[PDB]
């Protein structure tokens, strides 16, 4: 009626305001067991993935050197990520710490608590990425038939990689370098991949261990990953070539269902 609707619209106000108060009163109780510094579990991200920077869409790098617009997105997307590694964005010394030019042991910056507050990151220099830093060549190699991808290991909080104790690198330094090796996925791709040139820190083809462990976006904002740049200086023209890059270690794991866990696959095609 006109007067008993106020008694049915008032029960459903209190009941639905009590359900909301119980749902919110339990989400804030669950969140009391969730730390703001480290994740409760590392089960899905524990074995880090390994990815390339150009953020290529369908695992296919296809472009034509004589067309400035086929590789325009490829070249313009590397710049966005390498802007934060610019030597002019690392001048601040209150945040950045200058480690050596040679790999060393993992740098422990303390414990996962509020002591020391903000922690000091270790700066990475572009010019270690010779021919791929962009300090000399504005296009990172795509102007010619020399694509250059930049490999990065996915950030895992508190994770310290352990390099192995494939072929030996002949410049081993395994105590402080995590090896990365890019090779053709098939025999008909190994025969056609040609020459692969890596550009890492200190002439070592891998991720130095002195940038680990990561401390997680609150203790370490402005954190710069170690990068490995791979250039294919001579590959078959007008062909789709499959290339698989792997990081070797005893922390690093590989999965038959996750195609990007410790590995990645990129199909490089250069058209003429």
């Amino acid at each position: 009626t006109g007067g008993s609707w106020f008694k049915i619209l008032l029960f459903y106000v209190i009941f639905y305001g009590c359900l909301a108060g119980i749902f919110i009163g339990t989400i804030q109780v669950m969140l009391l067991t969730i730390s703001e510094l480290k994740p409760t579990y590392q089960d899905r991200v524990a074995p880090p993935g390994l990815t390339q920077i150009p953020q290529i869409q369908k695992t296919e790098i296809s472009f034509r050197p004589n067309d400035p617009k086929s590789y325009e997105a490829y070249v313009l997307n590397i710049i966005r990520f390498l802007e934060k590694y610019k030597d002019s964005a690392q001048k601040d010394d209150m945040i950045f710490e200058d480690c050596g030019s040679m790999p060393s042991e993992p740098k422990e910056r303390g414990e996962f608590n509020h002591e020391r507050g903000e922690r000091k990151v270790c700066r990475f220099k572009l010019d270690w990425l010779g021919n791929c830093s962009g300090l000399n060549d504005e296009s990172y190699g795509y102007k010619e038939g020399k694509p250059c991808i930049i490999i990065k290991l996915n950030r895992v909080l508190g994770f310290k990689p352990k390099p192995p104790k494939t072929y030996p690198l002949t410049m081993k330094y395994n105590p402080n370098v995590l090896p990365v090796q890019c090779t053709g996925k098939r025999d008909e791709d190994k025969d056609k991949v040609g020459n692969i040139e890596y550009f890492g820190m200190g002439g070592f083809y891998g991720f130095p261990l002195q940038y680990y462990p990561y401390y997680g976006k609150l203790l370490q904002p402005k954190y710069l990953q170690p990068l490995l740049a791979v250039q294919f200086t001579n590959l078959t023209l007008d062909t789709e070539i499959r290339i698989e890059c792997k990081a070797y270690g005893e922390n690093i794991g590989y999965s038959e269902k996750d195609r990007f866990q410790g590995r990645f696959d990129v199909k490089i095609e250069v058209k003429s």
Partner: protein, 976 residues
């Protein structure tokens, strides 16, 4: 064919109407032609559907159209997804299983109405039937298939009538109804000269001519004309149709609202199309026909165990809605084992021992009054003891006669000596068997006394009609005319002997003078011959008819449950009232208009009729009213006792009662009651003491020949509707907790809380076995305190049930699942507020470094695995929130502390099935990630338990105020 039967005509023109002969029948050349014209005459059931249309109708029907629409939508979604060059094949499995669901429901439907039919086929009564007889003038064995018009058939007692014939020659044949050669009644059912196919023939030889064959027969009619008869929808079918309409309306409204929201808010067609199939697979109760056909079979078995042999299905569905019961007195309401306790002669009341007397009568046996009365009682009795068992006491000896006759035999044998010799001395020539119409048992005896009277006539019957035909009374061995001092004495004695609730019988005798009646005489039943008036009434026999022990409890439960009880006995309106007050039909503090006039000490007409609530109306009283007066009598007065009523007037009583929007349940045991046993909504045939005609015309058969079975049939007929409202509520509860996740996924952009295959696994696993487990529930405490259900006003699924299933418990099963979902996501890195508007980046196969709340970077397959774990957690949360949603659905007014958690042990099977399926789906089907399931940590099972110990508390405190505060806006509003 035709609605009229040719029976008024005499034999000469009955021969002309169909071309027959009374004696010789017809020759072969004509009989064969007539048989070819008419055809065979037999009763067979073979008509049935071609069953292809039946498989087609069971293939799509009710919920199946919606599910087929959903399957088509799923196929369209798959082809649209394949247009985008991506094929995860998750839609193929969903569509295949969805079609398999309809295939299995069709298989289960073929299982249905087969095991129920097998249960139905067991509820049926036979009669000794044979089709062999020797007939047609010359004594030849002729099969019943050759019986046709123009052929005369001579029948003998002990079998059924070979064909629907009109009797032309007969000698006192009897059927269950006198058979004669003369037209008696216009109606062919009672014309007394027509034989009925498949009807028993007691005794005697009768000859008749076939008048109908096959479709022309009254019983057959359109039996061989195919067509659809009996396909009327059962009440549960109507409720299921209403439920289907409600479900379709809700689903259509939700889909239309979401589509009108998505068309303007830029949601691409795939999301809308997959939401419609989610809605279709969610809001469709699949395992409902199984738990519907289980409940009816279970209730049929329960009533068959409670002596309630319900035959039809419309009877078991409609029994629980009974409102009016028109029961009998002898039989249903009384033990039908009378004991003689009081005697009346010389205007005095003499008591006697009911049982275990073991001694002679207290009064003197040499009295002149007692000698003649005892001699007549011994002579007039027809009861005989059980042969071959003359070692057991008198009580244990059985008689195939009337129970009253057993009573007089028990009295006479324990008081007097041998009665066989006296009966042999008083040779009997003819005797009229006792019948309800005449209400007397006339006998003819030849006098062996030295005075050659040679004619002795002795009969017994109702004392009122006995003295109404008598003009004298006998005292101290001297005859005197019936003066007022004798009529008033008889009236007072009858009132005193009926006040305690006992029936009485009169006795008379007379010797015909020798001068008027010679030694040799011929006795005819039809001819009056010997006078039957002004006989020598002697005394009265008083015999106690105690009601059965359980009857008063049944009559009180009928009063509590709002079921009106009416008596249709044919006894005096004094004894009927005095026994109704004893059994509770006429309750205490109730007064008929005559008794309130007596209390006011004024005449009846000077008393307002509204001041009386009871009514004891004689048969002629309602014989003199138009139907409007009968309707107003049945409306204004609560307790009505139709005493002194004709057995046929049950027709009038039932047809008047049915015009009050009420369901009547009359109980009759005779072929006279069969027309009234057919008009009633639930006709009831008396079980042990009953005729096969009644058991064939009744919708329900007793097996304890007792009242309190008609009420324990109602008490479990109500259980069907009580346990269906508990089965259609638990199913509907988990229906908005399966489509809310997708609504929030579309709106807020959270990663998919639950998949599409998961909300189908919920319906398949944790919605079927617990649904069946609620059909085994026992009765509540208020089942016999509720008014009878109205067929039109009340529905199985009302608005409040659906609102409480969707808006109350369905919204608490979503808030508990979302807590576990947020717990699973937050403990791996993604905080609750980091998940908003994340679905676009979450489902991009190219972003393999998505950054969580701690800065870590996740590949695509790991996000996929976390989403699978989050959906498994939602599924587990609504498997545990539906364990406290099956405990609280075992009741609608009581608590578990009263009903008992362990009294129904199929609830535990349903709970174990839920737990086992949930453990198989996450640890057996999650070890290899498939169908969106992954292994679940031990914490993620008990997170939703606090929200399950909330649904139970809320319902317990909802029912507590229903119990404490009836009709206080809480019983009015919050009661499903």
């Amino acid at each position: 064919g035709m609605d009229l039967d040719d029976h008024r005509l005499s034999n000469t023109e009955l021969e002309q109407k169909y071309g027959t002969n009374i004696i010789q029948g017809l020759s072969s050349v004509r009989a064969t032609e007539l048989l070819a014209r008419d055809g065979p005459n037999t009763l067979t059931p073979p008509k049935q559907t071609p069953e292809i249309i039946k498989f087609l109708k069971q293939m799509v029907g009710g919920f199946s159209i919606l599910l087929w629409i959903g399957a088509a939508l799923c196929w369209i979604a798959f082809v649209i997804q394949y247009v985008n060059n991506s094929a995860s094949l998750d839609n193929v499995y969903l569509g295949a299983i969805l079609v398999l669901v309809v295939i299995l429901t069709g298989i289960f439907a073929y299982y249905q109405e087969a095991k129920s039919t097998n249960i139905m086929a067991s509820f049926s009564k036979m009669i000794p039937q044979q089709a062999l007889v020797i007939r047609d003038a010359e004594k030849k064995v002729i099969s019943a298939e050759q019986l046709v018009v123009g052929d005369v058939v001579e029948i003998k007692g002990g079998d059924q009538i070979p064909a629907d014939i009109r009797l032309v020659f007969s000698q006192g044949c009897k059927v269950d109804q006198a058979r004669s050669t003369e037209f008696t009644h216009e109606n062919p059912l009672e014309t007394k000269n027509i034989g009925f196919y498949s009807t028993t023939c007691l005794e005697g030889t009768a000859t008749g001519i076939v008048i109908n064959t096959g479709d022309r027969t009254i019983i057959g009619r359109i039996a061989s004309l195919a067509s659809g008869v009996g396909s009327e929808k059962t009440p549960i079918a109507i409720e299921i149709e209403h439920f289907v309409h409600i479900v379709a309306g809700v689903a259509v409204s939700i889909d239309i609202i979401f589509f009108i929201t998505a068309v303007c808010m830029k949601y691409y067609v795939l999301d809308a199309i997959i939401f419609l199939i989610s809605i279709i697979v969610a809001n469709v109760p699949e395992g409902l026909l199984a738990t519907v056909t289980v409940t009816l079979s279970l209730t049929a078995k329960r009533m068959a165990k409670k002596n309630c042999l319900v035959k039809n299905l419309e009877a078991v569905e409609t029994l629980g809605s009974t409102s009016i019961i028109c029961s009998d007195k002898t039989g249903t309401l009384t033990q039908n084992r009378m004991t003689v306790a009081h005697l009346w002669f010389d205007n005095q009341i003499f008591v006697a021992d009911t049982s275990e007397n073991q001694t002679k009568q207290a009064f003197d046996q040499s009295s002149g009054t007692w000698a003649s009365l005892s001699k007549i009682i011994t002579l007039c009795n027809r009861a005989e003891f059980r042969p071959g068992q003359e070692s057991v006491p008198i009580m244990k000896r059985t008689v195939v006669g009337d129970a009253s006759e057993t009573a007089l035999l028990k009295f006479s044998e324990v008081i007097l000596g041998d009665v066989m010799g006296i009966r042999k001395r008083n040779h009997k020539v003819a005797e009229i068997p006792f019948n309800s119409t005449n209400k007397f048992q006339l006998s003819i005896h030849e006098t062996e006394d030295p005075n050659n009277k040679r004619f002795l006539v002795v009969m017994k019957g109702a004392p009122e009609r006995i003295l109404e035909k008598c003009s004298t009374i006998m005292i101290n061995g001297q005859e005197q005319p019936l003066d007022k001092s004798s009529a008033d004495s008889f009236h007072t004695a009858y009132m005193e002997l009926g006040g305690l609730g006992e029936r009485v019988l009169g006795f008379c005798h007379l010797y015909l003078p020798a001068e008027q009646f010679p030694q040799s005489y011929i006795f005819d039943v039809d001819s009056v011959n010997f006078p039957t008036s002004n006989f020598c009434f002697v005394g009265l026999l008083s015999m106690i008819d105690p009601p059965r022990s359980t009857v008063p409890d049944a009559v009180s439960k009928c009063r509590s449950a709002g079921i009106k009880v009416i008596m249709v006995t044919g006894d005096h309106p004094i004894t009927a009232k005095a026994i109704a007050k004893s059994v509770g039909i006429i309750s205490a503090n109730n007064e008929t208009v005559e008794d309130i006039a007596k209390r006011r000490n004024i005449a009846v007409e000077q008393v307002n009729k509204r001041e009386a609530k009871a009514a004891v109306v004689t048969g002629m009283e309602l014989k003199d009213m138009t139907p409007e007066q009968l309707d107003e009598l049945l409306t204004n007065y609560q307790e009505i006792v139709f005493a002194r009523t004709s057995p046929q007037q049950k027709l009038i009583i039932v047809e008047g009662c049915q015009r009050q929007d009420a369901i009547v349940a009359v109980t009759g045991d005779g072929v006279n009651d069969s027309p009234a046993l057919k008009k009633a909504d639930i006709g009831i045939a008396m079980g042990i003491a009953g005729s096969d005609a009644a058991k064939n015309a009744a919708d329900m058969v007793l097996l304890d020949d007792n009242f309190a079975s008609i009420v324990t049939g109602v008490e479990e007929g109500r259980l069907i509707f009580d346990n269906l409202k508990k089965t259609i509520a638990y199913t509907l509860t988990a229906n908005i907790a399966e489509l809310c996740p997708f609504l929030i996924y579309i709106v807020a952009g959270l990663p998919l809380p639950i998949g599409t295959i998961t909300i189908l696994f919920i319906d398949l696993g944790t919605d079927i076995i617990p649904s069946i487990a609620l059909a085994y529930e026992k009765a509540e405490s208020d089942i016999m305190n509720r008014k009878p259900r109205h067929k039109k006003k009340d529905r199985l699924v009302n608005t409040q049930l659906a609102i409480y299933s969707y808006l109350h418990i369905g919204l608490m099963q979503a808030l508990g699942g979302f807590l576990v979902y947020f717990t699973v996501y937050a403990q791996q890195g993604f905080w609750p507020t980091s998940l908003i508007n994340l679905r676009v980046a979450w489902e991009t196969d190219d972003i393999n470094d998505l950054e969580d709340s701690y800065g870590q970077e996740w590949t695509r397959y790991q996000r996929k695995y976390l989403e699978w774990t989050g959906s498994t957690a939602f599924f587990v949360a609504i498997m545990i929130q539906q364990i406290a949603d099956l405990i609280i659905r075992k009741t609608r007014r009581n608590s578990i502390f009263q009903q008992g958690l362990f009294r129904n042990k199929v609830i535990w099977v349903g709970i174990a099935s839920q737990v086992i399926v949930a453990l198989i789906l996450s640890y057996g089907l999650g070890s290899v990630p498939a169908l969106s399931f992954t292994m679940l940590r031990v914490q993620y099972w008990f997170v939703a338990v606090p929200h399950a110990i909330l649904i139970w508390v809320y319902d317990e405190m909802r029912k507590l105020f229903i119990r404490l505060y009836p009709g206080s806006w809480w019983d009015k509003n919050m009661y499903y």
